[PDB]
Design a protein around this ligand. Sequence first.
Ligand code: ADP
Lengths: 374, 50, 131, 60
Amino acid sequence: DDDIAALVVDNGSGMCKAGFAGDDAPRAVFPSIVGRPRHQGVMVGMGQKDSYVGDEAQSKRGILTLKYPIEHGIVTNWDDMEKIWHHTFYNELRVAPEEHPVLLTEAPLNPKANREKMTQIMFETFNTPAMYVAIQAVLSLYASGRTTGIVMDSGDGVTHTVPIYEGYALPHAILRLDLAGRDLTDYLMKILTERGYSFTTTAEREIVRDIKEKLCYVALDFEQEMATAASSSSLEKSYELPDGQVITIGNERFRCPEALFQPSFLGMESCGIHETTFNSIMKCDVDIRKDLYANTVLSGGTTMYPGIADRMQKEITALAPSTMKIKIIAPPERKYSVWIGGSILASLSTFQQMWISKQEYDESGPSIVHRKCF
Amino acid sequence: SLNRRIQLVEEELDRAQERLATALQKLEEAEKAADESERGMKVIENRALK
Amino acid sequence: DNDNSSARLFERSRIKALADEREVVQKKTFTKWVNSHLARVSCRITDLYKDLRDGRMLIKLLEVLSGEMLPKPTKGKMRIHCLENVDKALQFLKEQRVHLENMGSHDIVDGNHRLVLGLIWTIILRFQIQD
Amino acid sequence: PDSNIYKKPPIYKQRSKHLIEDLIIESSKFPAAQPPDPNQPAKIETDYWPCPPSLAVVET
Ligand SMILES: Nc1ncnc2c1ncn2[C@@H]1O[C@H](COP(=O)(O)OP(=O)(O)O)[C@@H](O)[C@H]1O
């Protein structure tokens, strides 16, 4: 059959996912952090290890400083990204990178040097036979199974909305907002000071991120929820720190996700996500807005708070004309949907013609990616 | 020497007993969830057949 | 809530099942490959995770594959001596310029499945056998 | 990089008129004044050491 399954690697600001072409689910999922020791080593006889990558960095987070190589969808330290890719290929999947083609994902709007640098790294350091760069929001529409629709994708570093009609994308209506889960985590660290809890270092940022994943939700009405929380203490939850201490957040459960809809809490002039989606729909042509309203697709791990679908539907219905229906399509496994789309892209027969070969790279330099990728 | 040997075996026995207890509790929780699943199964079946 | 439960079901079933299926098959293959080379010294491993903890068997496997004389294993029964032996094996691997990432002595000693399997895979792929 | 550290000599290691006393000086170096038995195991691994061993050795 001579068909070799192509590795699909989804790289985000928060977590790295990796698997094979045609599989249902990724084989490896792990956080994208690189940690380094910050204290004296006195037990002579133990082994020395310069850096910690992935789950092992999270396991020993006490004695390490953790740094994210990718910030706001842009990778800043390339050596950490190379270490993460090496760990992915050799310790998570146990495959030879020179055997399989690799498919990579990136944000829609970004600096142009990122594509060239990943192309050069994948063609020189890892000796892959072919590679391709795709946009995550298109892969979400592949995972949905519908040809037309508007895709909003919010991850750990970037939020972006694209419209697509019958497989044709409108590049002038693509909108990018720099609001994501890391800013929400920082805001939760800020507003937890009011109750008396102080979190400063990076391990505390991981703890606050876990608290946000456990005990945050979106209120359908913000003022009603604020009045209810002020009236009684029924809307309170308790969390347990790793050292045994118990904290009670209470009112802060629905104030952190509200910054997604009102960015004035963070000092940003830019509008909310619902406003961005409505503006992206309104920037399209007149007679495709009917199809774009009924096919709104949510994606990314940031869209996993409870009550996002109902609140976004209510806000968009308030903005849109009342004569036609608006529904929000939120699959339960949306967090991995981008990767799933990539797998479908690696399974199509015509996509074997779309790979960037090594000979083509050798002829055209790192600039071939702008010509051969959207 | 025999004192330390008995110490090691006793510690391992206590650890094994703790693991057995938590495994039994997890099994009980799994059985309860399995019962709730078939409750939901017949109520959804009734709705669909109507 | 309910969507979180569905996502938990999806990950816990699919990702875990596919992952540990692949580790089981690759572990059996790697165990057979190691047992093929370790019969010269007449040493045999029954479990790949457990038998590589003390570091003696890794030293003997590198002894067979390289064909050279590694330094003395440290005479001991403790955790420190196991760390010392695994660190000696990793230093000999660094001598041959075999590139390992996220590889530490305490990771091999503590019995991490993924890192032990990755170390064996790097031994099979990158390291070359002298005859 | 690629430097092996264990097969280097010790750092302190890197730098007549009587026979009878020199052999006594040689014999005084060992923990007992006679050299130990070559096929006897050392005190570290003789299972008489007071400190507890690692989990892996006990498991095996
Ligand atoms: N169940 C959840 N509930 C609320 N927030 C979540 C949940 N899961 C993940 N997140 C947030 O989403 C982020 C992870 O998003 P992710 O999908 O990894 O983005 P990317 O893949 O683009 O890096 C985390 O920082 C976390 O704050």
